[PDB]
Chain length 461, copies 4
């Protein structure tokens, strides 16, 4: 009813869809569990329906590369719509085709290594802020909740690198600026609202015409004016805003004032919970594998003796650091899937893909596939040693996606976390508590996030 006949025709296997719901009832255990099970039951490819919407999973690295890289421009340029977005229609991660291509161009030079290297001293300052607060909770032997302290850090780093605003959000939890921003939390695509959207995507236009937006009308309205104040306070009298302001001082067609705001917002949304979540997954791994934590602290003390301040260059110097981070991202690729809409009838690597189908790469499951990874469930940073790193297919390991539409904030994200990890590990050790969920259970929900929030003992070195 009525496109539920598609994959049966094409010869592609898959779970049988119920009328209207398609296969969504199978998300009761989460995106990730659904995806592993399918991959095991059905093989290298399979199909399922999010409501009426046909989704084609693929697991062949060649075929993955064709979608994400080769035929990105021609065919697989956009992601799937997901709900009423109002003006956030112009955010880069949401935009489509030529508007996207334009925005990606105007915004790429913002994420170069040159710009990033300038942003280092800023991101650093809040490392120290992170430490002082951590210590206050280490001196009072009270088990620490990672996401909050990391949240406050991620928040602190975002505010400063995007707008110049400098706040201790942990101690200023109630700053109007800190407030709005913390409501920019990841979207739970299996919460009642979005599941309804899936069964009733014909309801999205209805919601749009009522100016209802999955980005709360208020947080947005606060930042719009906030920016249009900053914009007009800097003008005239180092951050993403500035870089964007300088850019509309001319693809092409510049950057409109409202366009600029939407990017500003999408970066917060992109960097905030992600940076904080990943830092938590890492700290958890580091606490449940005390040797890894020790090795890392020794690597750090070697590169930066006397607890020397980390620098851009010293960060990229640290290899085990890079290993620890990568392996965590294998275990917890917070995007879970990559997706592209098929805009044309095509044939890639011998398979016909009809227009309109959503093509999906199941990153979580691929990251834990036995056929590529020895002891996949196990946390083993050595997989990423300069020795073994060559035996890792870049289209099986894709925490940041691949191709022209991969994570634009990748370099920034990695640099951010690593700066945090270094300054923190220079100072503290992190130990499980009786109350620490071991082994960490993943949310049965729609985000990659722990079933129970990570809590750990923190002692001063």
């Amino acid at each position: 009813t009525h496109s539920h006949g598609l994959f049966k025709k094409l010869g592609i296997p898959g779970p049988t869809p119920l009328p209207f719901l398609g296969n969504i009832l199978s998300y009761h255990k989460g995106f990730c569990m659904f995806d592993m099970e399918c991959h095991k039951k059905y093989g290298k490819v399979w199909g399922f329906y999010d409501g009426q919407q046909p989704v084609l999973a693929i697991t062949d690295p060649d075929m993955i590369k064709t979608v994400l890289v080769k035929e990105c421009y021609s065919v697989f340029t956009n992601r799937r719509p997901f709900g009423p977005v109002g003006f956030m229609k112009s955010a880069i991660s949401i935009a489509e085709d030529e508007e996207w291509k334009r925005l990606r161009s105007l915004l790429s030079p913002t994420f170069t290594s040159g710009k990033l290297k300038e942003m280092v001293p800023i991101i650093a300052q809040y490392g120290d802020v992170l430490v002082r607060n951590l210590r206050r909770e280490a001196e009072t032997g009270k088990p620490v909740t990672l996401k909050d302290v990391f949240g406050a850090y991620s928040m602190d780093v975002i505010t400063s690198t995007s707008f110049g605003v400098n706040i201790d959000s942990l101690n200023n939890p109630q700053d109007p600026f800190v407030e709005n921003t913390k409501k920019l939390l990841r979207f739970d695509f299996l919460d009642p609202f979005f599941l309804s959207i899936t069964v009733f995507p014909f309801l999205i236009p209805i919601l749009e015409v009522l100016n209802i937006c999955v980005f709360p009308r208020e947080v947005t309205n606060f930042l719009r004016k906030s920016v249009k104040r900053m914009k007009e306070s800097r003008l005239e009298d180092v951050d993403f805003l500035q870089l964007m302001i300088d850019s509309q001082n001319s693809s092409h067609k510049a950057l409109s004032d409202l366009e600029l705001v939407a990017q500003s917002i999408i970066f917060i949304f992109a960097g905030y919970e992600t940076t904080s979540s990943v830092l938590s997954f890492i700290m958890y791994e580091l606490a449940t594998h005390p040797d890894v934590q020790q090795k890392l602290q020794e690597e750090i003390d070697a590169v930066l003796p006397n607890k020397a301040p980390p620098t851009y260059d010293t960060v990229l110097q640290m290899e085990y650091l890079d290993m620890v981070v990568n392996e965590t991202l294998r275990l917890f690729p917070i995007a879970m899937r990559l997706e592209r809409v098929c805009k044309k009838d095509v044939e890639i690597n011998g398979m016909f893909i009809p227009k309109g189908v959503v093509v999906m790469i199941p990153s979580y499951a691929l990251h834990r596939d036995p056929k590529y990874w020895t002891e996949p469930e196990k946390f083993l940073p050595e997989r990423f040693s300069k020795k073994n790193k060559d035996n890792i297919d870049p289209y099986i390991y894709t925490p940041f996606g691949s191709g022209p539409r991969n994570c634009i904030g990748m370099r920034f994200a990695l640099m951010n976390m690593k700066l945090a990890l270094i300054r923190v590990l220079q100072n503290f050790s992190f130990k499980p508590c009786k109350e620490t969920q071991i082994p960490l259970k993943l949310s049965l929900g729609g985000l990659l996030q722990p079933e129970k929030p990570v809590v750990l003992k923190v002692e001063s070195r």
Copy 2:
């Protein structure tokens, strides 16, 4: 298209409706302006369409009494639906027919004079809090914004009379409890969202099935658990909650746990912005009529010499106080209209009213009708002197409605404000500022509220 033919048939006059919109474009100057104009152009009765929905305005006191009192139970029992309400369907002001009749019964004894007289010492304590904060801004000769300081007061009084929670919300603007509650602001029925609802009332069910609610899912979810904590902290170990808890210790059928929560919420919503708004309109009048302010302070010093603490009995003693308050409510009846749905074909005072029509009383306009009020625009408390008070028809002056479905918090509202006014006027005088909007312009929007927020000098007596 298609019921736009109704009033033409019945012989009832009114503005010509555009297809789909009915007459709503005529709200560009606001509910109140629309209503005065119609009353003048069309007479004692008229009709118009909120979208497809037929609305019948009436201005005859007999006919008003039949609707609000005589035929309340039989015919005119409910108000008009207005949007997706989810579980707030059970709030008393929203409920219908027998469920309403039941809730009104379970909740009436809560608002008796006996209960109210017990609540006095509590409401008082925050009078003093109001004073201390006011003084801090009087000692620093900085023009004061009424709604905030009154808001904080209204908020303080609500929290304490409904849940026991005691907070200085002005100095604790960032208490989690103070936060959620301040988002319970009056609904702007001419904002884009609600106007859309009017043209598309067929969209309300759609929104309901998506669990979208005009009461933010979060504020509600916070209070639901907050109550279910309090409930289980008091149980077992003077406020509305308690009174409601004691009541479900048995109309009939008790009060369900979720029912109780919805009342709790609706009271905040009812009392919060209203109490604060009305106090602001009064203080404004008192500043732009310095003699009234002086007379009032003299009345107060006579009843409570040496600035004696006000009491339940001393409050009802004060007649000019009561006059000042009533006249303000004439000028600014914050409900603006009263409404009832016609549930049956009926004939009242010689007029046929078909099923489904919304019957509306235009209180604002009636409060300013020349044919009942000499110099209606003028602020003249003497209209309400025990001498003249008899010449005022109770179905022309209806700040609190009338009948079985009138404002349940009337006595409480009046007592609250008066306690505030007394303690404040015992201590301060209130003087216009250069920046004070004189004469106050009303919002062209959908709430009765000043175009520009009231700001006034405050000096210590």
Copy 3:
């Protein structure tokens, strides 16, 4: 999601509902099969969900009588809404509460035995027409399709008893009047359109505002003017129209012109396919039980020798006729279920029934319950002999419902069929063909109708 918790709470058993769909996937084998299975699996009562909509099945005769008779006015007055109906909102079978009560009053005297006895000679004339056409197909030994020849008859009888229009619809299949009317076919509540309505009842208002109607806008528009012609051709210069016209020559409030049209339409819809279907089920039984057919012809020849024309009085004289008809209706009660909406919280025969629930009586299943009927599947007219007829509970056998809201055209329906059967059986015998589906399979769909259309040999006596 979200009322799917209802019956679990109340202690009422039933199939587990899927999110959104409720239990509708269980209609794949049809209303009737679903109902028998439930009754067997769950007992005397059970619950299920048509989408979100709670349905409570009941099988206790006392409890059935309370719903259909005792508390009809107070509680169980209306049927469930089913789709966009536009002006057909005023048809009696669709109307609600007091409007219904009014229409039932204005239209009841139309269906008295006195009026019916006047309509006899008319319904007769088309008996003879039925015979002549039948003979043309008996003389050409060509197997006859019952529903068509009966259809043409039912159609002929409707046209004449409701509007005076006299046509041989079988030989005039292409008369504009015959055309429109044949499109008034029973609604398939398990066809894609209505199932969608069930999952999305929030879409009915949307469809209404687009003037989309399950009664085709054209058939209706043709009859509206047709009537308003007839009305004004008779006025001024014996049928339902006339009876209705005389009635608005004055409950109360008369009958509006549009109200009259809607009744006219609903009668066609009620009588057309029903009369024709039932006549087919009977003729089928009579052919697969040749003795019953013989006995019946002998009863008929006894009462009306020399093939005397049947009369009102001679029809009610015939007992085996009445037996044959009743038993057929037991086996094929074309309504399948009876339903009432619960308009109030009530308790009937010891069970609480909350407001809003649909209360359903599963007539088909009850008609085939072992615990009341020996060899239920078997066609045995003797069950209805004046001897055994007393052992049949009127709230288990309900082909026409019961109570104030039972089939208004019952007497007419029975009289119509019997007149047909008599004139036909006076003349022909009816014999199975090689192509006759034996045993008749019921539609797995939403109407009570044969899987394969009944076809039988017809020979001249």
Copy 4:
């Protein structure tokens, strides 16, 4: 609300839009009147809103050519969506981009002059049928209704040229095949249904998921099987079907079975009412200008003496015929407007056109613009004399559109009408009646069609 700000920004003039409705209330006098008025009030370009949807009218021949010809492929490839179309999504006139380009390719060779020249003897046979029936009404001096007799002809020609089915639809008005087909009438885009679609285009997806289709589910379902019978009766044992069947005996990708059906349907819909309407407008002109009618009959008798049967070659021989036809099409271009959706930000002839805008050419108004046409309202075939025909801009006179997406059935349409006109005028003269609407008033509605149906005396030569 919310795109109603577009043209104000761009500097493009136009009527002020009401909230939600845009400018649609201005269609009360019809598309054509609205368009002339705008062109006069606002100049060479202007804008208006069909609901939220921005429409840009243009009248410069260069700019028109860029849209219809130059940038057809790149930018202006599709027409505007208009409603729920279900499987008719695949009809060529409805399809988009590459699917359209494909269908246009597969179907073009069907409309060559070679194929058309083969179809001539067929279209002829029904000329004679047209004559015989006409004569029956000429011999009984009873004023004739053109559209019916022409309708029957158009219908007869369609059936035969597309499926081989040969019927006298005028005398067989009640052939099942003739029936379904006559319900394929032009869509009234100002009827209640489509206007609603315009204010609520967000309702189209809702309607689609309910399988509701502006092409009646039944007519379509009858033709689908009809074709799939014919298909399998011809296979195996000269018309469009055959030409299409031979084509899927292989752009590319052939023609699916369902694709073929949708074309079949769209041709009926395209040719039926159009051919019949245009023939009526011409016959009307010919009756209200008796000299033109005489000249034409003399031209015809010169080319085909003794009433010789017309042939493909003799038809193209006749110049005044071609003149008469063209001028009629100037006066009544039954498409009224041409439209293309702007799929990209572009700049054509110095004007920026943003993505999403509908670009509209107002053919009716252009055909009656004083600045190109002397006495535009007057019917003057000499405008099209081989002398003056050169002074006519092909992008001002566009009865069939222009460019890659122009009327594919143009040659066929012209040939059809002319064959009809010749055979008819060889035999009859056509004279106004007392009841003939002179001067013909156009429908204030949404189709180009006479306010009152054309009726004329017909006498035998």
